[model samples]
Target: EMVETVCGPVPVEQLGKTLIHEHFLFGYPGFQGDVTRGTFREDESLRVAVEAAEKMKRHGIQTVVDPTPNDCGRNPAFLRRVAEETGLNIICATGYYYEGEGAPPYFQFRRLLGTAEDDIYDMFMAELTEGIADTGIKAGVIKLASSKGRITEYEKMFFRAAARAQKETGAVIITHTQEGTMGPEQAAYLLEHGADPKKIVIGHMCGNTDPDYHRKTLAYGVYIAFDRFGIQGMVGAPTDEERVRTLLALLRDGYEKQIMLSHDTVNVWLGRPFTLPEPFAEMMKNWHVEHLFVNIIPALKNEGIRDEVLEQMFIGNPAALFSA
Candidate 1:
């Protein structure tokens, strides 16, 4: 059995104890005026990504599915290196991102090169079926996004293309949203266009209002990302207490099987022009993937969350989420 994404169909058994939503390599910098301020050197970013993957493997995480968009370090070579160095299955992405005025050069290059919707769809499908330059590195999911509750005309095209790809294949569709505000809408859009509700993971849904919102997303039969676990104080996130509390509440409300969690850590900043700080500094302070096992699982245990529930969060649900 394989779970298909726009990029390709990947073996379902490969996804285990997975952190369903995360971006190991990303370069998208939302508009801040300067476009050439940040760039992620491939070598340095690879070291960080591989080191993180090794820690994840040690912590018993079997899979790290990167939702990195086409322009933001979705290179097949980079993904192959991470897999080789860490011995963890690395799944990459093949959809598109919000090419705001702050978009990266790859987005510009693709657009300037006149890559249309079918063009992108075909590219993604090729990676899935053809195995990304013959490294057998296929994208396990389609990654899409919306910013500030608004999906662009380009995004709509991407969404339809991703959906069409999923229908033609069996891949999962994952997304990035502006907090949780637009996640439900994003899911609805995909669902309306033929994407299977059970086959999608709506990332960043916890960055929203409450359990009601979480429940609503789960009601759609789509997995909800309880990810961004350690970045509670980040500008667009909920407080730490609220983060855990909401997830716990959602869990007790009978939806643990649809919940997934991850740190969603970015390895490095890709060069644009200006200097910027790490978005996950506090969360990453003396930490990596092991924090999930060393810290988060224990915290949930102390809160009366049982091993079975943690099982679903870390293992069972990820399998169901990506299973063919």
Candidate 2:
């Protein structure tokens, strides 16, 4: 089967060395209400994103899936520019973030629009099949998320809507778990509500330090993203070393096929002067998109991970997940 991308569709096998999660633009929820607070320069963002994608391209990345959902200022026009400029198969998403994370208050009250499930399901299905906001860039994946420790009422409604959409159209569901909470809970809720477990990806699984925690999530037959390679300091988040150890442990336990990797890094910031605070700026140095290829892969190999296993995580597994 062929996989759709910003540049167009290609055979799934041609989706070489994919980055499962990443972002080109992100303007937090409030940024929508105020433009000065979140400055988004198309020319500047394009320049920066192209530079980053070119660097990753040099490191052998052929595709990148930017799961920047609808509410978070997802820009398909700019994404198309980046793909055309860098020759990378960039895929964008269609869905809402966990309520309050990106869904503003107006969306929070959307449950009042008749049955919330039908409203959300129809919206997602239209975006997947038709197009998003006249851009003609149909989404290749469905993005969902939950707050720190709980799936709120609206969030559950969103999940049910996503489940219904998935059952109808075969699009992949990629999710977010704030601070590593509720990965398994997200899986169980979706599966019970009619999602195909194999088509769901529980993102941010690397934030938890426990290998058993990851194993438990994998038992549901879903893909787990060890995607936060260079991020840290969130409450209860694991260090990069801790994340790597958990990943190796999962591989040792034979769950390699169910795993995907990414940096979850944003090359072009869309809000608030676009500079991270002190320690955050310093920490972000190694969290660049190329960090996985330059640093982590070598580290994994040194730990006796075979070359073919590395190939599966970078290439084979992503192809299966997107095309499944």
Candidate 3:
């Protein structure tokens, strides 16, 4: 079986050493409209993203799932350029971000008009099978998201779309669970709607501190991505140290088969660069894409997590997800 990449289709075995979540360049919705504040220069952005991709390549990351939903300036063309230059297999995703922060205005309007309920599913299907727009670069996965407290009526449409597309095309479904909330809801909803548990990954599970949160989520039999390492105290997320403890506990308890790892590092922010003050700045010092290999993995190793256990997150699970 093969997984679609920005370049083209690659066999699942070729997805060696994967990071399941990250962004080459991301802008919150509406950044494009803010030309005065946006720092998106094609040449410079390309250079930075290529540099980041090369770093991943050096550390033996063959594929990175850039689940940058379209509202967040998801640029497959730019990703295609990066993949061509670096030869790092990049799997792009097609779907919507959560209603809270994502650009849901258009679809919300459509739903208001009651004109195009199938629009979401059709968009996902077209991107997965027919390629994204005229780009001819098909997406490899479907990304759907929900809010912090509850899955809103608006967001449920995306879950339905994602599940339908996954059923039709055999594409995997990865998700943005706000502050680690609604993951179990996302999992159970997708499963009941006909999505295979094997093809689903609930992302940002690291943001939730309560070990019971993970226990309940994983009990659903769908995988979860501890995809936000080194992100501390932002969006109510915990520190990497706390994340490591939770991860090791899960690993020690034999949940390795259902876990994947990534930094969710936005290599280049599409708008003006972020500036956090003082200790807040220090909080994000290690929040880079290579943070996993450089620091987190060694800590995991020091704690007696074996290489084969790491293999599940890095290589084995990715190949399994993309395979039919």
Residue range 1-324, candidate 3, lDDT tens digits: 888899999999988999999999888888888888775799988999999999999999999999999899899999999999998999999988888898877998899777544888889878989999779999998888899979988899988878888888888999999987988888889899999999899999999877789989898999999999988877788999999999888987899989999999988888777688878778988889889999999999998889998997899999888877
Residue pairs in steric clash, candidate 3? none
| Ranking according to lDDT, highest score first | 3, 2, 1
Quickly count the clashes in candidate 1: 18
Question: In TM-score terms, which candidate is top?
Answer: 3
Q: What lDDT score goes with residue 164 in model 3?
A: 80
Evaluate all candidate structures by whole-model CA lDDT and list the values in order: 0.72, 0.85, 0.89
What lDDT does candidate 2 reach at residue 215?
Answer: 80
The true-versus-predicted C-alpha distance at residue 175 of model 3, in Å, is 0.3
List residue ranges in candidate 3 displaced over 4 A.
none
- Stronger candidate by TM-score (1 vs 2): 2
Cα error, residue 184 of model 3, in Å, equals 0.8
Residues 70-163, model 2: lDDT tens digits: 8888998889999998889988888888865766466556656665678788889888888888788888899999988898887887798899
Lowest lDDT 10-mer window, candidate 1?
31-40
